Design a protein around this ligand. Structure first.
Ligand SMILES: *[C@H]1c2c(ccc3c2OCO3)-c2ccc3cc4c(cc3c2N1C)OCO4
Ligand SMILES: *[C@H]1c2c(ccc3c2OCO3)-c2ccc3cc4c(cc3c2N1C)OCO4
Ligand SMILES: [Ca+2]
Ligand SMILES: [Ca+2]
Ligand SMILES: [Ca+2]
Ligand SMILES: [Ca+2]
Lengths: 90, 90
């Protein structure tokens, strides 16, 4: 497999490390999204310590309105937190 | 860095390896998208040998209608072609 295919499989793996913990095993509820951001995105985002901050993050990404982050919405979230990076690649 | 972060950076890096070849350096035109799929996604997708297949993939990815695949749209494309994987992580 290519570097790209290995990165995609790695992305899916970590998403499931969090979505599979509670309730719907294929979506992140707020407590799972909080842990993923704090444990795994520490270079891209500030640690979340307040409930109101997690609420807003979820509200900003939850495009279909079900209260949870599915894989499609997570992938869009990954794109949003990378916006500043592209200029450095060009 | 975390496994997720390394994977995200790898995804951005391969996108730009193709998007930076011609024209808009931050989007994939049809030629760049075909090249990326054929060279980097050969486990997830069949080799593209027909113009109709390229046209259809671009049409399906291109949510803003500019004829090119930007990074957000690429993240959505990655999520689409990996749907069969998820059941292996629960
Ligand atoms: C984006 C970026 C990265 C890490 C953390 C971040 C952001 O935006 C805010 O939080 C990141 C990681 C790695 C690279 C590697 C290379 C880039 C840009 C990167 C970023 N950008 C700065 O350009 C070439 O290699
Ligand atoms: C997703 C899958 C893989 C290769 C080609 C594919 C798909 O779906 C459409 O075409 C793939 C590669 C690697 C892994 C690794 C592990 C998974 C699932 C994978 C897949 N699925 C089947 O679960 C645990 O590790
Ligand atoms: Ca869950
Ligand atoms: Ca949702
Ligand atoms: Ca281009
Ligand atoms: Ca587009």
């Amino acid at each position: 497999m290519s570097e790209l295919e290995k990165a995609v499989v790695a992305l899916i793996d970590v998403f499931h490390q969090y979505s599979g913990r509670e309730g719907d095993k294929h979506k992140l509820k707020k407590s799972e999204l909080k842990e993923l951001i704090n444990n795994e995105l520490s270079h891209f985002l500030e640690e979340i310590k307040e409930q109101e901050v997690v609420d807003k993050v979820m509200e900003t990404l939850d495009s279909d309105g079900d209260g949870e982050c599915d894989f499609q919405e997570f992938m869009a979230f990954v794109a949003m937190i990378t916006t500043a990076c592209h200029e450095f690649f060009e």
